[PDB]
Structure 1
């Protein structure tokens, strides 16, 4: 019924497609789509401590993919640790890019 269960694992197209320079100042200011991250601390007995390949990013969701399953964890329900394209670990609260990926690409509210 959902694409997730269909696009699970093809991290391949997320590989030979996702190579933007990953960086904190570039993590919440980037397109969450293929960047690799893990759910270290969350409020969900079934998503804490797990690692997946990011896929979805909307006003109410942030998805990661691994094996034959997906990482369903909103941005405000957990902390995402995406790895820097420089082999550097990024520690950022999914709350910064909470729902609005634009806010970062378009900077804070316009006023």
Structure 2
């Protein structure tokens, strides 16, 4: 939970992500370092939270905005921001799996 040091410091993430991410390829790419908004979720308190993805486990994304949120993948719908500022919308279900394990399909 060494995530608290990032609160108040999220500016460090600006311009850091280096991939060109699309709706086709996001399933295979780095989710860490992308800005994300949660457009829907089974848990009411998760809807509307925005920040950078700072970590990822099989069924969870750790997000830093105004505070740190641990949000589960499979019950949520995410709007990610690509480098040009366009938005990628995807159900979290499609992102289930360890970050390293997602490289293949």
Coarse TM-score class (shorter-chain normalised)? 0.7 to 0.9
2:33 aligned partner: 34
Q: Which residue of 1 aligns with 2:103?
A: 105
Distance 2:17 2:50 in 1: 17
Residue 87 of structure 1 deviates from its aligned partner by 2.8
Which whole-Å deviations, capped at 9, do the CAs of 1:64-95 have from their partners, x for residues lacking one? 2112x023211112011102323322110111
RMSD between superposed Cα atoms in Å: 1.9
Structure richer in strand, relative to its length? 2
Structure 1 unaligned regions, length at least 5: none
Number of residue pairs matched by the alignment: 105
Q: How does 1:31-70 map to 2 (within 5 A)?
A: 31-67=30-66, 69-70=67-68
Larger Rg: 1
Work out whether residues 11 and 34 of structure 1, in 8 Å CA contact, stay in contact via their aligned partners in 2: no
TM-score w.r.t. the length of structure 1 is 0.79
* Closer, same or farther: CA 88–17 of 1 in aligned 2, 3 Å: closer
Q: State the 4+ residue runs in structure 1 displaced beyond 4 angstroms.
A: none
